[PDB]
Amino acid sequence: XXXXXXXXXXXXXXXXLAVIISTITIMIVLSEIGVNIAPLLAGAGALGLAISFGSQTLVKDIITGVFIQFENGMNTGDLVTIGPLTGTVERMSIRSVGVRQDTGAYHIIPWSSITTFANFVRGIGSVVANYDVDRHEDADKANQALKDAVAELMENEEIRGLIIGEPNFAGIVGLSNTAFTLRVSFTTLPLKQWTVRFALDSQVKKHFDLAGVRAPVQTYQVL
Amino acid sequence: XXXXXXXXXXXXXXXXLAVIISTITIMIVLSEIGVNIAPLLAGAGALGLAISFGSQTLVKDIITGVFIQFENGMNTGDLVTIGPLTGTVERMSIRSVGVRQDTGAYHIIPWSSITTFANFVRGIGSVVANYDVDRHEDADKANQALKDAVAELMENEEIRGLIIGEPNFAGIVGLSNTAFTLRVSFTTLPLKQWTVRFALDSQVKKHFDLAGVRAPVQTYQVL
Amino acid sequence: XXXXXXXXXXXXXXXXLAVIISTITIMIVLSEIGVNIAPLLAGAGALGLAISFGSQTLVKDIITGVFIQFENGMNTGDLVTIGPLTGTVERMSIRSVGVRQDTGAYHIIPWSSITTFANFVRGIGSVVANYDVDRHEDADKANQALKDAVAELMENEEIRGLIIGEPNFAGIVGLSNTAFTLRVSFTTLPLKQWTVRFALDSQVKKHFDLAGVRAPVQTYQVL
Amino acid sequence: XXXXXXXXXXXXXXXXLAVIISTITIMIVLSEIGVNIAPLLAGAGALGLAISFGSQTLVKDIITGVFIQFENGMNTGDLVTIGPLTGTVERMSIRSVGVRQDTGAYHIIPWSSITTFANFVRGIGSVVANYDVDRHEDADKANQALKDAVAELMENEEIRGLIIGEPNFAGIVGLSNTAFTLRVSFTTLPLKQWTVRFALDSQVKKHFDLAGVRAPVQTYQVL
Amino acid sequence: XXXXXXXXXXXXXXXXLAVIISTITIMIVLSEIGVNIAPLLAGAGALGLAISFGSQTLVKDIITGVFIQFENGMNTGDLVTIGPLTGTVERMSIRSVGVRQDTGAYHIIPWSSITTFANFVRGIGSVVANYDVDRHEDADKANQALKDAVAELMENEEIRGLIIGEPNFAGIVGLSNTAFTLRVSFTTLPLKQWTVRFALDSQVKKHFDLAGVRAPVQTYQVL
Amino acid sequence: XXXXXXXXXXXXXXXXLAVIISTITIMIVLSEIGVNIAPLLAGAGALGLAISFGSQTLVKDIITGVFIQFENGMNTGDLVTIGPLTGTVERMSIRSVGVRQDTGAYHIIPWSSITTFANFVRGIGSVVANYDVDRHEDADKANQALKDAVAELMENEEIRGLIIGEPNFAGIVGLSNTAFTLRVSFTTLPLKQWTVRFALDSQVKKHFDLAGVRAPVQTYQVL
Amino acid sequence: XXXXXXXXXXXXXXXXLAVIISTITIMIVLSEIGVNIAPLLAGAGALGLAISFGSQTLVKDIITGVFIQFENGMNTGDLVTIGPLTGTVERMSIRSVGVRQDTGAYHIIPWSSITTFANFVRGIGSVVANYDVDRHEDADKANQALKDAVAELMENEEIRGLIIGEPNFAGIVGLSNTAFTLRVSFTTLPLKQWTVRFALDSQVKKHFDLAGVRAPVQTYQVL
């Protein structure tokens, strides 16, 4: 039986990364060779549980990545927002995503840290502008000024191509101790919101000055 | 017994995703073929525990999603609020929900991150408006002005269709060092709160100017 | 023994949600049919541990719910406060609770997220009002004014029915660089605190104006 | 052996909450009746691990409660502070504690959420009052004024019974750009701190006015 | 064998807190008495794992306590700082520590919540005082004033006994838009820092007034 | 069999860090020598599980490090940003990374604490400058001033070598109650952003003074 | 066999901290003495798992400590920064580190709470000083003043020995609504940054006064 067991073990070892495989092979051999390694199994299992609780991140991350990819949630060149960060995606790997912030940095984010993320290149983009006007100014006057500003904006051929449909004037949307707030909304081609917002702000300043609408002004009273 | 064991193993393997299934088959074979793989079982179990702690998120998320669906908590097109985000739901998948923020973004939120979420399309919508008035102004005067404003609002046929029942005047609801606060409440058709609030603010500004109620004013004293 | 084992397995399978039950049955059969599925057990156990770490939330939540119910902590129609949210409870399910915020929203909160929650419909409700008065004003004068205000309040038959017992004047309760603070306390029927607070604030403004008590006023000094 | 095994199983089942006990009995029977339920054991163990990770809270909470009780840390009627909450304890159960906030609410806190909690009814209560005085005022003048205020306080027979020992004047305790801060300390009967603090603040205002000590005053300089 | 097994079980049970011990005894008996309780073992193990995840806190806390005690980190009567709390230690138990805040409260903190804690009664105590002086004042003038203040302080026999060695004048330590900051440092007997700081602040006010050093003053400019 | 077992155990022990290996050897010996150490296995397994939950950090950290290295995410001498810290990398070990803050400190960060980190030496660096201008100033005037400033900047031969391509003027990008904001963008050689930003700010101040553009100015109104 | 088993158990027990060892010995004896303690094993294993989840901290902490020691990250007498704390290291034990804050306290921090820590005694120390100057002042004038200040500083023989190399003037580094900021950088012997910074601030005040550079001044406009 001795020679037979020896031959059996030989055949098995012949049938049998590399260092751990070698340790496991040594374990199976010592097991089959007249030794019952329960506590050696215990030590190797402690080591394996350690590496497990360690090497969990890679797999969690790659599966989160492939899931995000299934939903078509992020492509190369999009403008995404991940937590407190907003930038352009420059490259995606099987572990992490590369986001190029506007301040020049190059953030690397591993998928596990990505729970909820916003994308700016899906369909439409909107603009919600709010402007303040001194509480004492005439409401209709300022509102007509804002309407004239938007109308002049929509005449700019270069910008008109960026707005989908018609503007949406909401009128007054709130009062403060000093000012009331006008609001105008849009619906633009994706990723072009900010250009529209900037042109609108320029036109709004110009026309508020023309129509003589005053900016909000803090008020005091003495004695 | 050798040929018999061989035939048994053959039949079993014949009776026997793909790569892991193949590894498990190799394991059962080496087990039945004169080898006791306890530590090989240990390594494969470490790998499996890793993938487990990894692939937990998908199932947790899908069950959270189906639960949220059971309570009729979220449909396509509703206006929901999830954590620090408020927007419209554009599409729901078996892993995540698509929320369209007003700023044009397209957030993707996986159900696991959704613990508590608010919905604005269930039943009724309310309005609680607060306005400030200088501490020195006559209380009854300002309150009557606000009542006249609300009364003129309720005469606007377009808005009246949005208010359920009658307004609820609360009177003064608090004093500051400079101003006391009036409050009026409503109960409106769902999702129409903001239109009512805006019309009310416009009317309130107009009538506060007519009745000559002053806005709050900071007060100083020199020497 | 072959036919006998076959008959045994048949009887067992005859004696034997649905898909997992079928997989378990296949497992017991392959086990009894000349195969020792230790690693198949390992894979199925990984899957089961995954679903376990997943389907834990439902049971945790239902037991937390039934516990909260045992303590009579929340009923339909009460006005509760859960974390940063305050509203009315509209309906309770075996997984979550429906809270109707005052802003019209309809929050859904699962019991697991509920650790500590306040309820406003248990027994009594109290009012602790603080008012500011310019540092230079006479203490006794302002205090007597506040006492007269409370006295006139207690004469309002409609409100008197809401106050339990007698008011509790505390006198000055703190000094600032500009103002000292008066305080008056109450004990009211449940859920009626705010009506009392509002009536009290109205009366306090009126009587502070009558008695000529000044509001706090920031003070400066030049050069 | 068949009839013998049947009789054995019968006797065992005869020797044998209710639904789980029934499932366990079915398990032991199928085990003893010619079936080896390893994977059925696996499914039942997954379910049990789920309920375990679920029903952990009740026991954790009751043991935390009995521990808090061992240290005599909280009784009915005491004034405790738990996290961001301060109120009176109205009733204690085997799972949670009932705290009555001053604003009328009735918080329910489960012991698990209680890590560190303060109690105001153990032994003594102290008072540390700080008052501000304009930087230009004479130090000795203001300090003597405060001493006279405390002296008049200690003459009030109703309050004297609440102060243990003698006051402790610390003198100036800090400078700002505008004011220096005086401080006086006490040691009072438990739960009576606030009454003493309020009486002291009243006397301090009165005597600061008598002695003509000015409150702090912001200072500017033009051009 | 029946009578023999019965006698064996009897002897064992004879050889055999109380309720759990009884359940375990019942388990060993049913085990030895012709029943293989694997799933009963599973249920009892679920219960035991629950109590384990529950009764972990007591032992964790007592070992953390004995460790803190080994380092001589906290004694009865010391003035410690634990998280956001600062007070005197009144008594220590095998689970928690009793800290007496200055505001009269009596906090109970269990050792587990104590990660990092400061102690004020180990060796020496230091004082780092910063004072502000208007940007336009002469540097040497104010510095000499502060030196004279410290010199007069060191002449107070009662205080001199509390300062170890010599003061350490650092000169200017920073500029603001309005003021530059002088700094003086000390090294005092333990627990006596605040008395020294207060005496120093008194002397500093007196000597800044004598030498005519102005406090910082906000500056404006009109039109 | 006694002598045979003895010889077997001897051979095994002959075939058989050091202290734990010795304990495991003692375990296997006592196991093979007529003793079944199940509870000794339990104690050793508790100890091993402890060390496992302890020695997990080293391996997790080294694998996170080698992963970060695979993505070429951090080299010696780069300027990285890790959480709230921004500095230069001075040396990398198999456990942690050494970051040299600008304030002279030498932070040591272990890879586990590194989830998302930014790098400033990958490709390009950008500049987004915003400047404020009083609301009343002429828009075209200030914009032309800023254009002249940038033009003079691009004439500086030393700086021109640092800017890639052409500046990008966005015009007005927002209104406040007091000021509107101009914006100019760049794209520079990596790590040279700040030099460009500083030169640009100098030129902008000079040219805003030349063209007489006023800085924003708070506005008041009395009575 | 009875006497033989008795002798075997005797020999084993003869071959066989103290209380747990005794319980384990009792377990092995009852095991070998005709009893199969599976559920007793279960209870002892629950207790052991409890102590494990408890006594994990000591080992985690000691290994974190020895790791920090391997990287030469902290010695006796260094000036380190750990989280929100900055002080001198007074002594290190096998569990915790003793940090002496400047305010006299003596913090004890266990290594587990130390994730990222800064050290100020490794190599070099730097200084980055920023000063504000009124927006209307001449840029070249203020910059030349700052250069003269630094030049006079470098003439102080006592300080010159602390600066490595040459100062680095950056010019303007930013504009505000009221002030532009000058910046000068250094590179000093370790731990000597603050002395240099203080001397520099003194010289800067003196020379800004000489050259007549004004501090920033808030600006207003009335009506």
Coordinates of C-alpha atoms in Angstrom, one line a residue, chain C residues 96-212:
Chain C
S96 CA -42.3 51.6 4.2
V97 CA -44.3 54.6 5.6
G98 CA -45.9 57.4 3.6
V99 CA -45.2 60.9 4.9
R100 CA -47.0 63.9 3.3
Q101 CA -44.8 66.9 3.5
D102 CA -46.4 70.4 3.8
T103 CA -44.8 71.4 0.4
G104 CA -47.0 68.8 -1.3
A105 CA -44.5 66.1 -1.8
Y106 CA -45.2 62.5 -0.8
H107 CA -42.1 61.0 0.8
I108 CA -41.7 57.2 1.0
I109 CA -39.4 56.1 3.9
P110 CA -38.5 52.5 4.5
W111 CA -38.4 51.5 8.1
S112 CA -34.7 50.7 8.1
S113 CA -33.9 54.3 7.5
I114 CA -36.0 55.2 10.5
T115 CA -33.8 55.1 13.6
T116 CA -35.2 58.0 15.7
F117 CA -38.5 59.7 14.9
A118 CA -40.5 62.3 16.7
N119 CA -44.3 62.3 17.0
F120 CA -46.4 65.4 17.7
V121 CA -49.7 63.7 18.7
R122 CA -48.8 62.1 22.0
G123 CA -50.3 63.8 25.0
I124 CA -49.4 67.5 25.2
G125 CA -47.8 70.2 23.2
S126 CA -45.7 73.1 24.4
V127 CA -44.8 76.6 23.3
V128 CA -41.6 78.4 24.1
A129 CA -41.6 81.9 22.6
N130 CA -38.6 84.2 22.6
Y131 CA -38.8 87.9 21.8
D132 CA -36.0 90.5 21.5
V133 CA -36.1 94.0 22.9
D134 CA -33.5 96.8 22.5
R135 CA -30.9 96.7 25.3
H136 CA -31.6 100.2 26.3
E137 CA -35.3 99.7 27.0
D138 CA -36.6 99.4 30.6
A139 CA -36.8 95.8 31.6
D140 CA -40.0 96.1 33.8
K141 CA -41.7 98.1 31.0
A142 CA -41.2 95.5 28.4
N143 CA -42.0 92.6 30.8
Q144 CA -45.2 94.3 31.8
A145 CA -46.0 94.8 28.1
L146 CA -45.5 91.1 27.4
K147 CA -47.7 90.2 30.4
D148 CA -50.5 92.4 29.1
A149 CA -50.2 90.8 25.7
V150 CA -50.5 87.3 27.2
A151 CA -53.4 88.5 29.4
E152 CA -55.3 89.8 26.4
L153 CA -54.5 86.5 24.6
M154 CA -56.0 84.4 27.5
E155 CA -59.2 86.6 27.1
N156 CA -59.7 85.3 23.6
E157 CA -62.3 82.7 24.2
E158 CA -61.4 80.8 21.0
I159 CA -57.8 80.4 22.1
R160 CA -58.3 79.9 25.9
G161 CA -59.7 76.5 25.1
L162 CA -56.3 75.5 23.7
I163 CA -54.1 76.4 26.7
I164 CA -53.7 73.9 29.6
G165 CA -53.2 75.7 32.9
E166 CA -51.4 79.0 33.2
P167 CA -48.6 80.7 31.2
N168 CA -45.2 80.7 32.8
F169 CA -43.2 84.0 32.5
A170 CA -39.4 83.5 32.8
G171 CA -38.3 87.1 32.6
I172 CA -35.0 87.9 30.9
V173 CA -33.3 84.8 29.5
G174 CA -30.2 86.3 27.9
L175 CA -28.3 89.3 26.8
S176 CA -26.7 90.1 23.5
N177 CA -24.6 93.1 22.3
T178 CA -27.8 94.7 21.3
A179 CA -30.9 93.1 22.8
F180 CA -32.2 91.1 25.8
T181 CA -34.6 88.3 25.3
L182 CA -37.9 87.8 27.0
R183 CA -39.5 84.3 27.2
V184 CA -43.0 83.0 27.9
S185 CA -44.0 79.3 28.0
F186 CA -47.2 77.4 27.6
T187 CA -48.7 73.9 27.6
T188 CA -51.4 73.3 25.0
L189 CA -53.6 70.6 23.6
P190 CA -51.6 68.4 21.2
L191 CA -51.1 69.6 17.6
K192 CA -52.4 73.1 18.5
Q193 CA -49.1 74.7 19.4
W194 CA -48.7 76.7 16.2
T195 CA -52.1 78.4 16.3
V196 CA -51.3 79.5 19.9
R197 CA -47.9 80.7 18.9
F198 CA -49.3 82.7 16.0
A199 CA -52.0 84.4 18.1
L200 CA -49.4 85.2 20.7
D201 CA -47.1 86.7 18.1
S202 CA -49.9 88.9 16.8
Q203 CA -50.8 90.1 20.3
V204 CA -47.2 90.7 21.2
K205 CA -46.6 92.9 18.2
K206 CA -49.7 94.9 18.9
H207 CA -48.9 95.4 22.6
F208 CA -45.2 96.1 22.0
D209 CA -46.3 98.9 19.6
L210 CA -48.8 100.2 22.1
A211 CA -46.4 100.3 25.0
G212 CA -43.7 101.8 22.8

